[PDB]
Design a protein around this ligand. Structure first.
Ligand SMILES: *[C@@H]1O[C@H](CO[C@@H]2O[C@@H](C)[C@@H](O)[C@@H](O)[C@@H]2O)[C@@H](O[C@@H]2O[C@H](CO)[C@@H](O[C@@H]3O[C@H](CO[C@H]4O[C@H](CO[C@H]5O[C@H](CO)[C@@H](O)[C@H](O)[C@@H]5O)[C@@H](O)[C@H](O[C@H]5O[C@H](CO)[C@@H](O)[C@H](O)[C@@H]5O)[C@@H]4O)[C@@H](O)[C@H](O[C@H]4O[C@H](CO)[C@@H](O)[C@H](O)[C@@H]4O)[C@@H]3O)[C@H](O)[C@H]2NC(C)=O)[C@H](O)[C@H]1NC(C)=O
Ligand SMILES: [Cl-]
Lengths: 208, 190
């Protein structure tokens, strides 16, 4: 019989009102002999109709894959509403239902601190710019580096880490060529989190 | 009944004064122990403890473990084999970072130890001051960097007054690619 997987929206899509958060319901192992699939979508028990279901696509193991995409309201997701995808198929004894919702917890506001390279690293060709984000809850977050209106993507974040007061922290490390740091270029750490005013704050870093 | 074989704590393998051990835990009893096939006899088996658990502890030689030797613990007998994670060692660089000026508003400040460029991921990072291990720090797990080496960050939280008073804090790093498997970097207001 078919199997169902329900995927949440990207955190950043839920946090930035201009972006498009979606819940995605995927169905696999749909047989040739019972190929039709019906999706029903519910937000807190109430059925919604606006979903966009894609036509079935045959896989290399002669089974079909069918995907339905529900556009969500940012506030609905952040208010903890449950999204249910019910999948119907004639090979199933009963319809398969899957429910998901935002991680629970009292929100806490992160503090964002930029830290320049250690003097000892200035011997090297590349230097590390550090963005400490601490005190946030829950763990869903987006941390990004940029300079002069361009994303800097030679960076890596640690996963969120549980701190001694029950909040999370993480560190994001931006690696840049030493000359760029010495030349006086401004680098910025953008943090996106539900407990921030407007879900956004930015802290900048440049050589003195 | 099932068998679990646990490696030594990385720090025990790295500090020659410490006592690294391989631990063979059997749950729900004879033990045979082998180092690269060759049987060894020095293991110390504990007495048993609504199912029984029995544990045998083998003392290992630091250099044997770091040289990649395999440790084997034994309807039919169950065998389990373990050894050190493989990979060309790379030396970590250790950098201490003081608190951001913006955090100096707060009652507690964050002291940061960046350790980067190390391989493999086994490591020990610890904070201390005035001959005492510091209370209240947390490290991130190792993270895979864009050049294939790992990095991590260790955050020490201290009261602002301690930072302002001029107290020295030290980040100790223990890793196989370091000379003597040890390096220390200090951080203070001055
Ligand atoms: C017949 O074929 C179909 C189709 O498969 C394709 O075609 C075939 C022919 C072949 O070529 C395949 O190679 C093709 O892919 C088969 O369909 C597959 O069926 C699987 C179930 O049997 C199903 O597996 C499940 O996958 C779940 C989803 O997780 C996977 O995908 C993630 C993608 O990311 C998503 O989520 C993140 C959020 O974190 C989001 O950012 C993304 O945008 C996206 O929405 C992966 O992240 C994830 O992990 C991979 O990647 C990470 C790194 O990111 C890495 O660390 C991992 O090692 C992985 O590589 C997954 O891969 C998954 O949740 C689910 O788990 C369930 O079960 C476990 C227990 O095992 C349980 O603990 C969980 O709670 C959970 O309930 C499960 O693994 C495949 O998704 C599906 N394939 C497709 C394309 O839809 C079909 O099975 C087959 N039939 C046969 C042989 O009979
Ligand atoms: Cl020692």
């Amino acid at each position: 019989g078919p199997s169902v997987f329900l995927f949440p929206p990207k955190p950043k899509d839920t946090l930035m009102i201009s972006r498009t958060p979606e819940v995605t319901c995927v169905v696999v192992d749909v047989s040739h002999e019972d190929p039709e699939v019906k999706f029903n979508w519910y937000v807190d028990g109430v059925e919604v109709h606006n979903a966009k279901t894609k036509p079935r696509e045959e896989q290399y193991n002669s089974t079909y894959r069918v995907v339905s995409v529900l556009t969500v309201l940012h506030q609905d997701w952040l208010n903890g509403k449950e999204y249910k995808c019910k999948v119907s198929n004639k090979a199933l004894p009963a319809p398969i239902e899957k429910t998901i919702s935002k991680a629970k917890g009292q929100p806490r506001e992160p503090q964002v601190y930029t830290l320049p390279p250690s003097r000892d690293e200035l011997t090297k060709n590349q230097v590390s710019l550090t963005c400490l984000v601490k005190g946030f809850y829950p763990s869903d977050i987006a941390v990004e580096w940029e300079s002069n209106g361009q994303p800097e993507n030679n960076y890596k974040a640690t996963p969120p880490v549980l701190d001694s007061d029950g909040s999370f922290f993480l560190y994001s490390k931006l690696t840049v060529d030493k000359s760029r740091w010495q030349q006086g270029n401004v680098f910025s750490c953008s943090v996106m989190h539900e407990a921030l005013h407007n879900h956004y704050t930015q802290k900048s870093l440049s050589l003195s």
